[PDB]
Design a protein around this ligand. Sequence first.
Ligand code: HEM
Ligand code: HEM
Lengths: 298, 298
Amino acid sequence: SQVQSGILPEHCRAAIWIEANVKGDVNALRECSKVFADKLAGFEAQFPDAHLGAVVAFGHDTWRALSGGVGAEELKDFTPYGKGLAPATQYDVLIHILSLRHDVNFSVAQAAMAAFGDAVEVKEEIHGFRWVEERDLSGFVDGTENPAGEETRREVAVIKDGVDAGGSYVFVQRWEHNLKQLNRMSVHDQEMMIGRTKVANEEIDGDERPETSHLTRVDLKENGKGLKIVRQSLPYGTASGTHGLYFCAYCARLYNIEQQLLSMFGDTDGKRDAMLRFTKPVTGGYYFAPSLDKLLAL
Amino acid sequence: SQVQSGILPEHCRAAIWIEANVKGDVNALRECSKVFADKLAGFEAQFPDAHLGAVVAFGHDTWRALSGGVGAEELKDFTPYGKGLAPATQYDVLIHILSLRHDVNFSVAQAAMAAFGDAVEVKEEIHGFRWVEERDLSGFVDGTENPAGEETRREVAVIKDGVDAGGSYVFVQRWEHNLKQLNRMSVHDQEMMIGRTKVANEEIDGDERPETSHLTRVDLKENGKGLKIVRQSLPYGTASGTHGLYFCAYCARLYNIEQQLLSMFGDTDGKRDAMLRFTKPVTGGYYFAPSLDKLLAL
Ligand code: HEM
Ligand code: HEM
């Protein structure tokens, strides 16, 4: 059972995320996904230069109908966390395209619109870009402790056996940064908000940083082992308008993601992530990405 | 006199254009431009291999004020052409940033906003990207006959002497492509529309292509010599929403640009550019880019 090509590649330079709702018969998606998968393989062969991959994933209601209610038992509609502090915008279809080349990405995105256009209504399209030194627009490096290498990323993100082998759970959440509020903070204040030093990007030990620090919020364990995720987030936006981080995570279990959300947004222990001092999520949804084999034969 | 670094570089991968109006006192721009140019010089040293360049240019009324009526006598407000076919959105300040790296462009743009933000209200920010094979989103190679090499480009784009030595005239015009309308045309018909063959990008002899063809519209001569411009246009937009070409031209004389506009939009001989079958301009403005010396010396 083959994984879809966009989950495992590391250090993309650019990505496109399309979120869309079914219009009409959900069953049309079966043929759309096969058409797009074929176009995608063609682009991957045409531009090996790009290290291109993509993922098609589906929301609870849509996947339940496409799978006939079999498998993906964890999948559910994203609903608001923190009593609304993390809003919900659950759509039916997620397409995630990533590579080293924005120009190739755009061609693949056009192919996706051609494949799905008559079956969906697009609600969001975000073009992510890797920024200097792989930093978030806040000036902090983003990705350091992400799982590295195919073996470890596969362990964290790709379902290993069962009816869903080769699939993955996906979470996407667009954040809007208020950089003027960030810059009112001393660098020490910022570093206590994140849990790592800003320029040097060294971790502050768990006892030196407040329990509201981001790293304390998301360093969660079960049975003494950390709940890991594979993050494909990138910056997005304009300099003069809206900008921030398009957050994107893959995980073999929805649980690891949900537990970090419950932690960050006050649900678990009443404390909230200190990053909410300067940035806020404005979308959110859960999706199931089937194995490529399952995607090809819906 | 030194030219601003953004005019002459060839084959940028990505650009950012910012159009803005003055908010308070126009004289605040004097310190804003010096601050930004200082910041730009720092990014050009920090990223010596990115081919980074930027241009600050000014609308008619804002330049008259900043320069005490001195020079830039050609500079005027952009006004509609073709009885409204080409609308006018003349603003006060144009900032154009280009390089091989979008991530570096975004840093420069943030610096532009840190420097001009208090003094202006941004009307538009557009991120351009070079597409596959340097093709416009219509599928036609864009740029083939552009002036190449620093000598020829300086002849065309940089003012040679006089009070304005080192400066240039800029025209920006965002177009919205309707690729559905494009793809209803046969390839032959598209080629007759542009004036070059589509895949091979070979010229079609002027006698074998309609006088409404783009090339016939824009390949103009005065006194037996071609009216050249230096184009920096790039594709922009999203696959599912608005997309097209952000047109951008530099010229030593406003006359070369205006003559092509008069031709394309039916004002010269009543014939209109055949590209209007599928795309349309929705903005337009004229700006004056002073040499880098005046920009620091305002
Ligand atoms: C629901 C949203 C998010 C989740 C679930 C999440 C999850 C994580 C995880 C699991 C880590 C690695 C922690 C470790 O084991 O060391 C991490 C690190 C980090 N995150 Fe978040 N993150 C989220 C949102 C954000 C946002 C919005 C930003 C910035 C604006 C951000 C910036 C960072 C930074 C700078 C690091 C440290 C560098 C790294 O290890 O990647 N995160 N995040
Ligand atoms: C939707 C907007 C436009 C598109 C898709 C477009 C596309 C093209 C293409 C495909 C070429 C031939 C390849 C090349 O030599 O670059 C070309 C040439 C050219 N274009 Fe455009 N163009 C657009 C707008 C404009 C405008 C508004 C102007 C001038 C005001 C202009 C001026 C020129 C010039 C001067 C040439 C070179 C002609 C020659 O000497 O062969 N273009 N354009």
